[PDB]
């Protein structure tokens with residue numbers, strides 16, 4: 001008998017990831033989990049036919065039901081408008097979704113013990129979370145002004161006085177509200193993983209701009225989170241970007257990195273500040289190149305791990321909201337069986353290339369896209385059997 | 389006898405690199421080159437005793453004599469202030485020097501055939517270059533933040549909305565860049581590509597900051613088409629622009645052998661500051677003073693510290709010195725020393741950091757590497773042999 005997963009918003013996408021997405025649902029999710037599924041087709045053809053209305057509806061459904069899992073989508077350009085005869089150059093669905101929900105995007109590289117990283121010392125993964133420009137034609141003043149909405153005196157800052165020749169200039173901003181949300185998402189993400197949190201800035205150069213980030217982070221930590229943080233042996237603390245880069249390379253991993261300023265193993269999750277609404281997806285795109293080969297009837301070897309972890313992160317958050325222990329265990333089992341299958345030597349060509357070097361990869365070093373999905377399916381069914 | 393190397397500004401540093409620096413001069417430089425040497429002690433204790441005056445004097449010496457070679461130095465923090473009982477937290481000597489000199493910083497990792505790279509496809513080195521002032525402020529509450537340009541001839545006024553704060557306050561910031569500094573960054577990059585016979589790539593994000601980064605691309609190609617394309621085709625190299633997103637992807641898939649102008653083991657990494665005048669250069673290792681190896685040395689333990697990046701700081705400085713003086717003997721020595729350093733490693737003689745790169749630290753044994761003095765002696769023997777056979 002299957003697990004009652006509850007309410008989940010699902011978004012179908014394009015090209016190669018759309019194929020893999022269906023394989024994930026039919027081979028790894030649906031055989032074990034029943035969902036109250038709010039499905040929205042964000043494939044490029046259906047967004048065009050609905051005048052992108054489906055994208056707004058899917059975002060609204062995430063706001064209402066708190067859990068969304070999204071397949072990679074085509075962001076249109078001139079060639080895409082030509083390829084599909086689009087009515088418009090529709091805005092990227094992720095841009096539309098982020099504006100409606102807000103929050104912070106956190107990305108995490110899944111680590112397999114037999115797949116090399118940048119540094120071998122990285123044993124645990126980490127989670128990293130994250131303008132008006134114009135040309136100055138010639139000599140003149142560039143100023144940035146603040147006009148208070150209550151009529152009090154305007155304030156003018158000289159950006160630069162070009163006395164000989166021109167150049168460029170730009171202005172940037174950040175609302176307090178968005179810094180607060182950034183902090184709230186970062187604290188809640190660190191708690192949800194039991195990991196310490198670091199915020200990096202350059203508040204020594206940008207003493208007012210980056211200083212506002214460092215200040216607001218400490219204020220919200222001290223009042224709302226410091227007591228829950230050591231209640232879980234963790235902490236939060238601010239670094240200058242120079243210190244944190246050095247600390248991260250000498251580190252083993254397992255920390256959240258709020259940064260102010262192989263693709264098949266990159267996850268993304270949009271964490272809203274309320275701690276309730278999350279949207280998970282792969283950090284890569286629709287893999288058009290493999291999709292062309294798939295269209296010509298040729299063999300593909302596309303890495304589905306990042307797409308699988310979109311589902312597992314969403315289902316893990318759903319289970320946390322609903323206190324669904326069976327679903328929470330299932331989400332973990334699906335992640336572990338994914339890592340273990342690769343660590344046992346069964347992987348797609350991209351990962352085999354990371355080990356042997358692309359010029360020396362042979363066909364017997366990897367599985368094609370369909371062979372790998374079947375290997376995961378068989379291993380998943382064995383694992384869940386051994387858990388009863 | 390010995391080569392007359394001419395005028396060279398030398399800066400001594402701190403901790404383990406200070407030791408390696410003397411070993412390099414004693415065993416590799418002085419036995420073969422006589423120098424009109426302008427030596428400055430940028431050790432932390434001397435910087436404190438002179439109130440950092442030695443750092444400014446060394447920067448001016450590099451301006452005067454056009455060639456500077458610098459050992460790594462301690463940049464003080466709070467614990468350093470207590471360790472040495474410093475009068476104050478002195479600014480990093482590298483920032484001081486960079487501010488007096490200006491220019492473009494080029495970095496390059498030394499490639500050895502038997503030492504793993506991050507990507508196996510990398511078999512030739514690359515050089516990444518960056519050019520060496522914003523007004524940020526607090527937005528106390530709701531209101532309009534605009535940025536405005538008024539040309540000095542008064543014929544117009546352009547106002548751009550940065551953001552209309554409506555429910556609260558926040559922060560805002562204006563930043564600029566001059567054409568002149570973009571031109572310095574272009575000229576240094578084009579000339580560096582010619583000096584090595586490598587193609588040059590510029591990378592920006594002009595898909596988002598289409599005016600800010602677009603002017604970078606514009607100025608590079610104008611300078612290229614009107615001043616450098618003939619020399620690039622004669623050496624059959626080229627220059628192209630790339631969006632940073634695809635340049636990163638292309639770079640991981642490449643073999644190397646190009647200069648990468650960027651808009652945005654450590655013992656094998658060099659850094660060279662090329663000043664706008666095209667004539668003044670300062671070279672140094674891209675790593676620090678290796679404090680923890682120094683602590684091992686202090687307690688009598690054997691150390692195995694990589695001197696390659698420090699050696700190449702000397703060779704780059706000596707090579708540029710020889711180029712300014714048309715000194716064919718000094719130019720031959722500089723290149724010979726670089727060859728000896730790479731050949732020695734490729735022959736299987738290396739310090740522990742490189743052996744760990746190959747085999748992984750848990751599998752390293754003492755017979756897999758040489759200690760700091762053994763490696764320097766091995767380079768000494770091979771340098772003596774190499775020069776004699778000429």
Ligand SMILES: NC(=O)C1=CN([C@@H]2O[C@H](COP(=O)(O)OP(=O)(O)OC[C@H]3O[C@@H](n4cnc5c(N)ncnc54)[C@H](OP(=O)(O)O)[C@@H]3O)[C@@H](O)[C@H]2O)C=CC1
Nearest residue numbers: 072073074075263264284285286287288289302303304350
């Ligand atoms: N979140 C989203 O919705 C995103 C969507 N896109 C969209 O995707 C489309 C194509 O973009 P593109 O530039 O190709 O970006 P992709 O992320 O699709 O990059 C594809 C390239 O990276 C490698 N790669 C990426 N994912 C995988 C994987 N899962 N398994 C194996 N290899 C992988 C492949 O390299 P190789 O060819 O060497 O095998 C492939 O050619 C565009 O229309 C774009 O709008 C792009 C980014 C994000």
Ligand SMILES: NC(=O)C1=CN([C@@H]2O[C@H](COP(=O)(O)OP(=O)(O)OC[C@H]3O[C@@H](n4cnc5c(N)ncnc54)[C@H](OP(=O)(O)O)[C@@H]3O)[C@@H](O)[C@H]2O)C=CC1
Nearest residue numbers: 460461462463654655675676677678679680693694695741
């Ligand atoms: N150019 C300059 O003037 C710079 C100076 N510094 C200064 O140096 C001091 C210490 O800096 P730190 O943070 O230790 O960074 P370092 O670059 O001095 O060393 C950090 C680590 O990198 C490895 N390493 C670096 N260089 C070598 C080498 N030549 N051979 C073998 N291994 C090497 C060692 O790793 P392992 O321990 O694993 O062997 C070392 O512990 C600081 O006071 C800082 O101010 C820092 C940066 C630049």
Ligand SMILES: CN(C)S(=O)(=O)c1cccc(NC(=O)c2nn(Cc3ccccc3)c(=O)c3ccccc23)c1
Nearest residue numbers: 107108109122124125126127128245248251252253254
């Ligand atoms: C790319 N820029 C130059 S940077 O963003 O400024 C920068 C600078 C320096 C270091 C890092 N990287 C990490 O600290 C890091 N990275 N990964 C992969 C990873 C990538 C993106 C998002 C999540 C994970 C890990 O798996 C890991 C594991 C243990 C410990 C650290 C790490 C990034």
Ligand SMILES: CN(C)S(=O)(=O)c1cccc(NC(=O)c2nn(Cc3ccccc3)c(=O)c3ccccc23)c1
Nearest residue numbers: 495496497510512513514515516636639640642643644
């Ligand atoms: C912060 N960012 C992540 S990024 O610095 O912009 C970035 C992005 C992507 C790739 C690279 N790196 C390389 O393409 C590269 N790197 N090294 C090491 C090296 C380090 C410093 C200076 C010179 C060389 C090589 O030796 C090499 C050799 C052959 C071909 C390529 C390479 C950098």
